[PDB]
Design a protein around this ligand. Structure first.
Ligand SMILES: *C(=O)[C@@H](NC(=O)/C(=N\OC)c1csc(N)n1)[C@@H]1N=C(C(=O)O)C(=C)CS1
Length: 260
């Protein structure tokens, strides 16, 4: 069975696997440690970007508002922001960079505008997500220390919220479409969930990487002849310097999407 397959995958993986798939055709779900907390790492950027999109609903000039990028803003990974030092990036461009290239500086600019990590949590709560919590900025929000509650959520919680954000009631249509466009254009998830699905399927996703070999990916999947699927695959390991295992995410995705 699917459950036995996931258990077998986890057993040989040397880590802890968290999976939550929602089939929007009948709202049925495939869950594996779906109620356990996992460090979200960069997958948390979706909530920060969505928070700004929500604001843009009542501020028509927000997305085009320029933000100055200084050398001091650069952190551990910022392939897009680095290209704009001494210049500016609009909030929309920061949203794009944060989601499609997982630019950590872009994420920090989004948090800074919103007023801090706690403001992202407040946004998640307003969506009915009582699990999500953002406590730090990038890159420390990716320490993924075992048992640390900071910057964590559960696979089911994130799956429900991602569904609400991309296919549901969370955002106004234009903003919802914008978030979807950003997710579909992600460049960082080839080897993750996407690697375990038919090549013709359209996918939007946000990956995450951190210490303890934490390897995450959250996605919305559009089959060619079926209703969308929302999938969260989180993976973490016992040693701080473990390698990321995107192959495990691809494997989990293949397992739970069999038949769709
Ligand atoms: C998000 O998860 C973030 N990850 C990091 O910045 C870190 N490691 O990534 C290799 C990190 C920060 S502190 C620490 N011990 N480790 C970005 N996300 C991705 C992704 O997988 O989507 C990146 C490719 C780049 S940085």
């Amino acid at each position: 069975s699917v459950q036995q397959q996931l258990e077998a995958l986890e057993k040989s993986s040397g880590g802890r696997l968290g999976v939550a798939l929602i089939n929007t055709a009948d709202n049925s779900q495939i869950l594996y440690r779906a109620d356990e907390r996992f460090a979200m790492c960069s997958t948390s950027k979706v909530m920060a970007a969505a928070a700004v999109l929500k604001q843009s609903e009542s501020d028509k000039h927000l997305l085009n508002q320029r933000v100055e990028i200084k050398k001091s803003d650069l952190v551990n990974y910022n392939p897009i922001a680095e290209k704009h030092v001494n210049g500016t990036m609009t909030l929309a461009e920061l949203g794009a960079a944060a989601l499609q290239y997982s630019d950590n500086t872009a994420m920090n600019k989004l948090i800074a505008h919103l007023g801090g990590p706690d403001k992202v949590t407040a946004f998640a709560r307003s969506l009915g997500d009582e699990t999500f919590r953002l406590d730090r900025t990038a890159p420390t929000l990716n320490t993924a220390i075992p048992g640390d509650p900071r910057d964590t959520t559960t696979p089911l919680a994130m799956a429900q919220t991602l569904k609400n954000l991309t296919l549901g009631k969370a955002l106004a249509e234009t903003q919802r479409a914008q978030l979807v466009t950003w997710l579909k254009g992600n460049t960082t998830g080839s080897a993750s969930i996407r690697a375990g699905l038919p090549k013709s399927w359209v996918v939007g996703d946000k990956t995450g990487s951190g210490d303890y070999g934490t390897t995450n990916d959250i996605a919305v999947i559009w089959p060619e002849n079926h209703a969308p699927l929302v999938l969260v695959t989180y993976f973490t390991q016992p040693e701080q310097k473990a390698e990321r295992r995107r192959d495990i995410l691809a494997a989990a995705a293949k397992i739970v999407t069999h038949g769709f």
